[PDB]
Ligand binder design. Sequence first.
Ligand SMILES: Nc1ncnc2c1ncn2[C@@H]1O[C@H](COP(=O)(O)O)[C@@H](O)[C@H]1O
Ligand SMILES: [Zn+2]
Ligand SMILES: [Zn+2]
Length: 382
Amino acid sequence: TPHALLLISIDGLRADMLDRGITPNLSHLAREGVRARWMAPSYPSLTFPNHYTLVTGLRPDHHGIVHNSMRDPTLGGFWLSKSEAVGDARWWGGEPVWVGVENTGQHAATWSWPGSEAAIKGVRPSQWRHYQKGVRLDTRVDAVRGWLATDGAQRNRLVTLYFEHVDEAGHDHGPESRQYADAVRAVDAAIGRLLAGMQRDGTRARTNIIVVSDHGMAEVAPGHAISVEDIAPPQIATAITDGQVIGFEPLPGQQAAAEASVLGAHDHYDCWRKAELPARWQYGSHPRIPSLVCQMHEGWDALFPDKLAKRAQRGTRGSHGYDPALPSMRAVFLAQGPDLAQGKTLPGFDNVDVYALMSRLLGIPAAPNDGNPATLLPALRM
Ligand SMILES: Nc1ncnc2c1ncn2[C@@H]1O[C@H](COP(=O)(O)O)[C@@H](O)[C@H]1O
Ligand SMILES: [Zn+2]
Ligand SMILES: [Zn+2]
């Protein structure tokens, strides 16, 4: 029986958060194993695009989950709260690690990983669910603990675990806030209880472990919020998305007015025709991407007008979704276990490279992907 992988995502954990004395368990794990200086998200530095890149080794441009909210000619609208869109395999391109695992006779078990509610390439994990808000830390930790300990025919090669708590506190109060730090401490403590119980179960010693985050978090000070219609009025172009990566689709015959008012440099954003976007972002080829794409600057939000009023103007808040080469957008990568090096540090690298490492650790043939299989070989013990 080969060594299991445990894949843990802490949403919006910024890469410097391991070096503030608030992650004792993750810091111990890094000392015991392998730690990257940081891991750079793919564009857009949003939650669904980047979780799915992590498991596919593909840029959002290739895998089709190009934003959290999308429209498609055949499939219509997609967003995080339209359940039969998220559960529709047709949105999800490529092959995520759980599909590759089950296709080998082995079994994957997911706690709420993006894409895990759909039969991607007609393949569901053996364990999965419909994401619901407000689940307890110990509830999900103890469930994952269960699935690592199972045996016989219901033995899992892969187990995933997700935590929203850090991401949600960053939006609410910013990454330098005490709430964000408490969220980090809480998720770290929860992972320590998982790890301790895995030892008591005797699964820790045969399980490889990888902890990552999908991106980091920038502070969004008060007064750093504008209307999407300050960028382009409704009469000329439809704001497909808001937040930090704003997509416009010009009303029929308004391409020229939309472009004259939108394209180029503005106070706190810039905009591009999708095929002319900065090539380092490797983004803009997928048809599901709107015709015009605007990138807000670090620290700034553009919101649908109805939000912009009801946003109780007071608190420091936060956001991601900015340029993935920003230090503030940097995610975490660490790993530890029987097939991984010990006491090792790795240069900063890009999140597409994670796929090739997991595929080896999971004993699956690696699906075609955008990453470099050489990058994370040093992470392996031998
Ligand atoms: N599988 C899921 N289905 C629906 N919503 C999710 C899921 N996973 C996380 N979320 C929530 O959606 C948000 C992601 O948006 P963002 O972090 O702004 O890119 C997080 O703050 C989570 O609370
Ligand atoms: Zn996220
Ligand atoms: Zn977020």
